[PDB]
Design a protein around this ligand. Structure first.
Ligand code: NAP
Ligand code: HJI
Ligand code: NA
Length: 172
């Protein structure tokens, strides 16, 4: 399949998704992420810093009030509620309104990844080797079809004592 370039022309609209999942596909439960890996936190910041980040309203809610908006990035929150407000950030009503920058990283959660996938050309995935089964109401990662080509890293070992690995996926 035809080659893509890592360089982002300023007149384009590159959309990437970045998430961390358990091997089962779980990304969230009860309004939180059920792990903290320093390597994943650092990786998330390395990829997203300097770009626009787009998140669903429930992901904004999951950020501690003292830390949001996440610094060094333009924070955009998706909501359908006309009275939802995000101090320090922009709330918009659609993905179309959110995707105005040349490079945008969609940072969660389950609903917004599913919504944004049709426009995305990159996914950066951390897989955590934690035995966490899927339960009703869990937020889940998108499943990538065969239009996506991927590179899977070898299993690595976190200082937190969990194995993890990184995937990078691309499509035209
Ligand atoms: N592991 C990770 O990488 C990762 C990353 C981020 C989040 N998470 C976890 O994922 C969970 C949250 O995911 P979630 O799926 O429940 O929610 P979400 O995707 O973060 O947010 C859903 C909300 O976004 C808004 N929304 C959805 N579709 C929209 C559309 N088409 N237009 C406008 N607004 C739209 C709605 O807000 P309104 O209800 O206000 O209308 C909806 O309730 C939490 O557990 C969080 O901790 C995990
Ligand atoms: C690191 C998690 C993650 N990892 C990958 N790979 N992709 C993602 N989209 C992702 O979610 C980013 C959005 C949710 O962030 C939070 C959720 C609850 C509490 C604190 C934070 C802020 C983070 C922290 O300090 O833990 C900070 F590092 F961003
Ligand atoms: Na990742």
């Amino acid at each position: 399949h035809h080659h893509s370039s890592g360089l982002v022309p300023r007149g384009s609209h590159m959309v990437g998704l970045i998430w961390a999942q358990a091997t089962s596909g779980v990304i969230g439960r009860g309004g939180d992420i059920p792990w903290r890996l320093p390597e994943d936190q650092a990786h998330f910041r390395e990829i997203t810093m300097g770009h626009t980040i787009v998140m669903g309203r429930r992901t904004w809610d999951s950020l501690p009030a003292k830390v949001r908006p996440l610094p060094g990035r333009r924070n955009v929150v998706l909501s359908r509620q006309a009275d939802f407000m995000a101090s320090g950030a922009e709330v918009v009503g659609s993905l179309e309104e959110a995707l105005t920058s040349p490079e945008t990283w969609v940072i969660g959660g389950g609903q917004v990844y599913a919504l944004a996938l049709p426009y995305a050309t990159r996914c950066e995935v951390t897989e955590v080797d934690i035995g966490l089964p899927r339960e009703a109401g869990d937020a889940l990662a998108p499943v990538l079809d065969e239009t996506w080509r991927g590179e899977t890293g070898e299993w690595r070992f976190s200082r937190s004592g969990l194995r993890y690995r990184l995937y990078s996926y691309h499509r035209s």
